[PDB]
Amino acid sequence: MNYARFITAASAARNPSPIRTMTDILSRGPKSMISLAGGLPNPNMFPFKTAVITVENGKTIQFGEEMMKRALQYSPSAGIPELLSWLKQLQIKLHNPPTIHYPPSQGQMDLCVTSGSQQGLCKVFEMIINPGDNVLLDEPAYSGTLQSLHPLGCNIINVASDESGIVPDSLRDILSRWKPEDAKNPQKNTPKFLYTVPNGNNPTGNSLTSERKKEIYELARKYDFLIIEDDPYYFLQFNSGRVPTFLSMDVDGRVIRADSFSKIISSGLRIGFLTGPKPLIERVILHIQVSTLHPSTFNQLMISQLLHEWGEEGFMAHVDRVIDFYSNQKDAILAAADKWLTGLAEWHVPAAGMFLWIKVKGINDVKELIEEKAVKMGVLMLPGNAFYVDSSAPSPYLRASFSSASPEQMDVAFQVLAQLIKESLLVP
Amino acid sequence: MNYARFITAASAARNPSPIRTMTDILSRGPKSMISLAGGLPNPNMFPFKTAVITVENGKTIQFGEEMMKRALQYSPSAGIPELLSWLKQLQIKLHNPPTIHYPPSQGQMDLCVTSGSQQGLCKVFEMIINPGDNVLLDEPAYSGTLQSLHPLGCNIINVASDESGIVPDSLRDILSRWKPEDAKNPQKNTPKFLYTVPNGNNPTGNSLTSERKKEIYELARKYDFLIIEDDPYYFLQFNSGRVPTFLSMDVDGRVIRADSFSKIISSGLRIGFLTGPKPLIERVILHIQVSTLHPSTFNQLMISQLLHEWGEEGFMAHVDRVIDFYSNQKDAILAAADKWLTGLAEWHVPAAGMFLWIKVKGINDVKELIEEKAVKMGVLMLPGNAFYVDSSAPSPYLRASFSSASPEQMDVAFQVLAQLIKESLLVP
Ligand SMILES: Cc1ncc(COP(=O)(O)O)c(CNc2cc3cc(Oc4ccccc4)ccc3n(O)c2=O)c1O
Ligand SMILES: Cc1ncc(COP(=O)(O)O)c(CNc2cc3cc(Oc4ccccc4)ccc3n(O)c2=O)c1O
């Protein structure tokens, strides 16, 4: 593969920090070296000395004097080596990517820890998009990506979707405006990428099937575009057995996958990871290097010590317990919607994630009902408008989270929603 | 002031997340509200439960069950409110900025916590720079900013400097190519900003005087450009009672200041802060929102609890102890340079920071001497080339850190240097 045609001139221009050259010759000269090249502050000046963090169904995490000095000090841009190696083994175990042993220039599998999955996505979008570029996605889409894409001046082409996610026939019809050979033509504008959330799409809750993923992949090869697999709900699927990912079928080295620990381990710690072809991951690490420098060393060490103690088994056992909690929350929100919203609204059972996407029946726009009227009654829900490229267009939809509210809180919230819908239905 | 000319079309296009409305309307409706809006995961699912962090010359920091849930959860893009309010009072106490009570559109003082000061600088550079824009700085300059600026396609105009930093007469002469009215002319290209490190410039160690800062400020008003005050060594000045900052004299609302906790509290925690005019800080927060989302909640809570317990007095007492350590390190490196490098090299006493900038006397380029020859002898130092826009140009300079090496380690390193200098002079 040739990755240069996908990236911007600014991304290609990025150079590594001069400290990398010193790090390369660190293991090339003697072992007991004196380093005056560095810019690392003296760790002994830092006021935090030791840390003890208690874990539920796990051994207490302890940072002694030496471990605390490491946790409070600068660390590599791509992430700490022990976290990177554990995550690489996890990706091999779960996805067995065809690119593991490819040459670096051919899209060899590479990983990098990011300050949440949002950072990975943001740096990936900025690395690729020139104004006027064509990108593909299915609307309604995650507001965070629409808000990232909007300032980049790309044309967002909406791909049709249903309860099983993106409709491959719709993607096929959209692509027919070009010929496969246009992808090699510098003056043709074939799509740079397809962006999708394959499990529990935010905000619909819909997931792609294996069959559809294979057809989509086949179209990505034919018209030579990348696939940005934003999969933060991969570890939050309600159905038994995880569906194979785009990364698992990536023979071409065309997939960039974002994984998140936000719903399973911690959202506040800002630790996610990106998996993709080495030349593209390298461009992302270089942009991260001049922005955050690296993700928090302390937070990485907390997560790394937890994952190593748990092992792959302990991690999977924890995700099962988390899925079980969200599955019970999903049943409770579905029972509340059946009770108060039957005949007033329409909804599908979410396949993954923490959201219920609700279509209000006899209202063109739910925005004032949700942003004003519901808030004054003490109930917060998100209007559907936020999940479309054209947010000014009227939306009869709303997104309801089932992550934390109790069944009684859901009962009160849905009773309020029903009351407001009824009020709106009476106004001619 | 009109800030529109200092912001790219992409930066201006940024919109806030839809949850901001849900955060603003939250404080106007009832008190016992039910939220199904936020995409916040259930905190009870997180595996870390409590934390105890020991502090030197301070009370032990403790995160109980409720505080840990907050620390592991999403938090506002600009930072946690208790940290923002403590830092705002610190900025008022230290700098008393003239912009505190200005209307928001006139450059009202605003702050935001960033994932290290590097993130603030990066977002500020990206917010301002269009390809072809002219920017001002004094070389040698921090490699991290040169590496951020390089992909942006701006023309970097070098301003002359000496032991007292930027020479105002040099800035005055450079600016004379334009007329003050050209800053209002869309087709004239007057500099967008002046970037400088006023205390302990990386890599020189030189600091600006009050008199020079006032003259520079006067030129920034005359030609209407911004001042990016990157001041990470503000709390590492060797002289007592700190020089007034550019922020302290910012009557026009033209200063963007970056502060860092990297040398005083922790580099690894990735917590810094930006202070500047509200319309510009707002553009930065919106870019942070689509990238990192927010700085680590856990790390912010650690620092906030430490600062609140210390108070402004406890913080200043800690910085005095840190300065005292670096002052002794500076004396030790100066004594090592006097012993070994007299007649072979030239250096100035650093006014702040942790670096000694050394000019080798009879060599045009020190790169092979430092990257190859010194490394094989077990001594690492940084070649000067990394601190110039044109890094390919020969440099007789080197940067030596005095943050951690012992006096004996400095003696061994400076012996090795003196040996290699003598070797490269006796070569026919
Ligand atoms: C004038 C000015 N402005 C802003 C800042 C950013 O500071 P921050 O974001 O922490 O607040 C600085 C701090 N510069 C240095 C940082 C530094 C970091 C290192 O670890 C890395 C380096 C790269 C990637 C990962 C980890 C090693 C050596 C370093 N050396 O040598 C430095 O000189 C500065 O000097
Ligand atoms: C498909 C997809 N891709 C990637 C990601 C990024 O995930 P991350 O970076 O944590 O790995 C997500 C995560 N989704 C949400 C995050 C979210 C965060 C909030 O707190 C903020 C929000 C803004 C600023 C500061 C704090 C509030 C509401 C939120 N809502 O409503 C969400 O839906 C995602 O759904």
In a shared domain, residues A201 and A242 = yes
Specify the number of domains making up chain B.
Answer: 3
Q: Could you say which residues from 103 to 132 on chain A have a Cβ atom under 8 Å away from some Cβ of chain B?
A: 115-116, 118-119, 122-123
Q: Amino acid identity of A343? A: G
In a shared domain, residues B249 and B233 = yes
In a shared domain, residues A363 and A393 = yes
B292 → closest Cβ in A29, A270, A372: A270
Assess whether the C-beta atom of B145 lies below 6 angstroms from ligand 2: no
Establish whether the linkage from the previous residue to A140 is cis, with ω within 30° of 0: yes
Domain stops at, among A287, A310, A333: A310
Query: Within 10 Å of residue A155's Cβ, how many Cβ atoms?
Result: 13
Min Cα–Cα distance to chain A from B167, Å: 26
Question: Which residue's CA is the nearest one to ligand 1's atom 31?
Answer: A39
Provide the pairing of β-strand A34-35 with B379-380.
parallel
Residue A399 marked as a ligand binder: yes
* Chain B residues closer than 8 Å to A377 by CB: 29-30
Helix (H, G, I), strand (E, B) or coil at B275: strand
* Chain A residues closer than 8 Å to B268 by CB: 70-75, 296-298
Rounded-to-integer distance, Cα B362 and Cα B374, Å: 17
Pocket test for ligand 2, best of B19, B70, B296 (most atoms within 8 A of CB): B19
* Ligand 1 centroid to residue A19 C-alpha, Å: 10
Paired strand residues for B156:
B135
Ligand at shortest distance from the CA of A140: 2
Provide the pairing of β-strand A134-137 with A193-196.
parallel
Rounded-to-integer distance, Cα B313 and Cα B319, Å: 10
Q: Which tokens sit at A314?
A: 């302990």
Beta carbons of B41 and A11 less than 8 Å apart? no
Contact B330/A at CB under 8 A:
no
Rounded-to-integer distance, Cα B358 and Cα A184, Å: 51
Residue partners of A107: CB distance under 8 A and separation at least 6: A1, A3, A99, A252, A253, A254, A276, A277, A278, A279, A280
Q: Amino acid identity of A109? A: M
Q: Which tokens sit at B103?
A: 């209307």
Q: Can you give the residue range of the structural domain that contains B34? A: 1-72
Q: Could you say which residues from 204 to 263 on chain B have a Cβ atom under 8 Å away from some Cβ of chain A?
A: 262-263
Instruction: Outline where DSSP puts E strands in B159-297.
Output: 161-162, 165-166, 193-196, 226-230, 255-260, 272-277
Half-sphere exposure of A133 (CA within 13 A, CB side): 25
> Hey, of A65, A127, A290, A385, which one would you mutate to test binding to chain B, going by the most B CBs within 10 A of its CB?
A290
Q: Amino acid identity of A144? A: G
Rounded-to-integer distance, Cα A373 and Cα A363, Å: 14
Q: Are A212 and A201 in contact (CB under 8 A)?
A: no
Which element (helix H / strand E) includes B92? helix B81-95
User: Is A181 exposed, middle or buried (CB count within 10 Å of its CB: 0-12, 13-18, 19+)?
Assistant: exposed
Helix (H, G, I), strand (E, B) or coil at B342: strand
User: Is B294 exposed, middle or buried (CB count within 10 Å of its CB: 0-12, 13-18, 19+)?
Assistant: buried
Nearest to A285 by CA among A75, A112, A73: A112
Helix (H, G, I), strand (E, B) or coil at B243: coil
Q: Are B83 and B113 in contact (CB under 8 A)?
A: yes
Task: Please give the backbone phi and psi of residue A290, each rounded to the nearest 5 degrees, phi first.
Answer: -95, 5
Which element (helix H / strand E) includes B52? strand B48-55
Nearest to B6 by CA among B212, B213, B253: B253
Q: Which tokens sit at A388?
A: 């479309």
Q: Are A45 and B266 in contact (CB under 8 A)?
A: no
DSSP B17: -
* Chain B residues closer than 8 Å to A34 by CB: 378-380, 405, 409, 412-413
Quote the crossing angle between the two packed helices A297-341 and A407-426, to the nearest 10°: 50
Residue A177 marked as a ligand binder: no
In a shared domain, residues B342 and B218 = no
Pocket test for ligand 1, best of B112, B115, B118 (most atoms within 8 A of CB): B118
Residue partners of A85: CB distance under 8 A and separation at least 6: none
Rounded-to-integer distance, Cα A269 and Cα B382, Å: 33
Residue partners of B282: CB distance under 8 A and separation at least 6: B110
Where do we find the tokens 């309020």? A416
Nearest to A243 by CA among A170, A168, A165: A165
In angstroms, the Cα distances linking B414 to A198, B23, B368 are 59, 58, 17
Rounded-to-integer distance, Cα A227 and Cα A224, Å: 10
Rounded-to-integer distance, Cα B395 and Cα B386, Å: 9
Rounded-to-integer distance, Cα A71 and Cα A68, Å: 5
Query: Within 10 Å of residue B21's Cβ, how many Cβ atoms?
Result: 18
Q: Amino acid identity of A332? A: A
Question: Mind giving me the DSSP string for B98-151?
Answer: TTTTS-GGGT-EEEEEESSHHHHHHHHHHHH--TT-EEEEPSS--HHHHHHHGG
Q: Are B122 and B96 in contact (CB under 8 A)?
A: no
Q: Which tokens sit at B182?
A: 């050209």
Query: Within 10 Å of residue B80's Cβ, how many Cβ atoms?
Result: 21
Q: How far is CA A240 from the centre of its chain?
A: 21
User: Is B264 exposed, middle or buried (CB count within 10 Å of its CB: 0-12, 13-18, 19+)?
Assistant: buried
Beta carbons of A49 and B36 less than 8 Å apart? no
Q: How far is CA B417 from the centre of its chain?
A: 30
Assess whether the C-beta atom of A29 lies below 6 angstroms from ligand 1: no
Provide the pairing of β-strand B134-137 with B193-196.
parallel
In a shared domain, residues B400 and B413 = yes
Q: Are A30 and B307 in contact (CB under 8 A)?
A: no
Nearest to B230 by CA among B260, B261, B270: B260
Q: Are B137 and B121 in contact (CB under 8 A)?
A: no
Rounded-to-integer distance, Cα B357 and Cα B347, Å: 6
Q: How far is CA B246 from the centre of its chain?
A: 14
Contact A389/B at CB under 8 A:
no
Nearest to A19 by CA among A290, A300, A295: A290
SS3 readout for A50-85: EEEEEECCCCCEEECHHHHHHHCCCCCCCCCHHHHH
Q: Are A111 and A259 in contact (CB under 8 A)?
A: no
Which element (helix H / strand E) includes B345? strand B345-347
Q: Could you say which residues from 78 to 97 on chain B have a Cβ atom under 8 Å away from some Cβ of chain A?
A: none
Provide the pairing of β-strand B272-277 with B255-260.
antiparallel
* Ligand 1 centroid to residue A289 C-alpha, Å: 10
In a shared domain, residues B304 and B322 = no
Nearest to A357 by CA among A168, A140, A150: A140
- Give CA angle at B318 (B49, A75), nearest 5°: 55
In a shared domain, residues B148 and B81 = yes
The separation between the first and the last C-alpha atoms of chain A, rounded to the nearest angstrom, is 60
Residue partners of A415: CB distance under 8 A and separation at least 6: A340
In a shared domain, residues B297 and B334 = no
In a shared domain, residues B245 and B372 = no
Residue B202 marked as a ligand binder: yes
Residue partners of B222: CB distance under 8 A and separation at least 6: B175, B180
Provide the pairing of β-strand B165-166 with B161-162.
antiparallel
Domain stops at, among A310, A338, A363: A310
- The backbone region for B403, taken as left when phi is positive above 0, alpha when psi lies in -120 to 50, beta otherwise, is alpha
Q: Are A418 and A378 in contact (CB under 8 A)?
A: no
Paired strand residues for A54:
B50
Rounded-to-integer distance, Cα B283 and Cα B267, Å: 25
Q: Are B246 and B99 in contact (CB under 8 A)?
A: no
Domain stops at, among A252, A275, A310: A310
* Ligand 1 centroid to residue B262 C-alpha, Å: 8
CATH number at residue A405: 3.90.1150.10
Question: Which residue's CA is the nearest one to ligand 1's atom 5?
Answer: B118
Rounded-to-integer distance, Cα B367 and Cα B385, Å: 8
User: Is B331 exposed, middle or buried (CB count within 10 Å of its CB: 0-12, 13-18, 19+)?
Assistant: middle
Tell me which method was used to determine the 3D structure: X-ray
Provide the pairing of β-strand A382-383 with B48-55.
unpaired
In a shared domain, residues B110 and B214 = yes
SS3 readout for chain A: CCCCCCCCHHHHHCCCCCHHHHHHCCCCCCCCCEECCCCCCCHHHCCEEEEEEEECCCCCEEECHHHHHHHCCCCCCCCCHHHHHHHHHHHHHHHCCCCCCCCHHHCCEEEEEECCHHHHHHHHHHHHCCCCCEEEECCCCCHHHHHHHHHHCCEEEECCEECCEECHHHHHHHHCCCCHHHHHCCCCCCCCEEEECCCCCCCCCCCCCHHHHHHHHHHHHHCCCEEEEECCCCCCECCCCCCCCCHHHCCCCCEEEEEECCCCCCCCCCCEEEEEEHHHHHHHHHHHHCCCCCCCHHHHHHHHHHHHHHHHHHHHHHHHHHHHHHHHHHHHHHHHHHHHHECCEEECCCCECCEEEEEECCCCCCHHHHHHHHHHCCEECEEHHHHCCCCCCCCCEEEEECCCCCHHHHHHHHHHHHHHHHHHHHCC
Atom of ligand 1 lying closest to residue A289 CA:
24
Residue partners of A23: CB distance under 8 A and separation at least 6: none
In angstroms, the Cα distances linking B274 to A297, A364, B94, B106 are 21, 43, 15, 18
Task: Please give the backbone phi and psi of residue A270, each rounded to the nearest 5 degrees, phi first.
Answer: 60, 60
Atom of ligand 1 lying closest to residue B201 CA:
1
Beta carbons of B413 and A58 less than 8 Å apart? no
- The string over A28-44, giving b where at least 16 C-beta atoms fall within 10 Å of a residue's C-beta and e elsewhere, is eeeeebbbbbbbbbbbe
Q: How far is CA B419 from the centre of its chain?
A: 36
Query: Within 10 Å of residue B158's Cβ, how many Cβ atoms?
Result: 16
Where do we find the tokens 């009109």? B2
DSSP B12: H
Min Cα–Cα distance to chain A from B181, Å: 30
- Give CA angle at B152 (B173, A111), nearest 5°: 145
In a shared domain, residues A85 and A175 = yes
DSSP B353: S
CATH number at residue A168: 3.40.640.10
In a shared domain, residues B273 and B178 = yes
Half-sphere exposure of B374 (CA within 13 A, CB side): 28
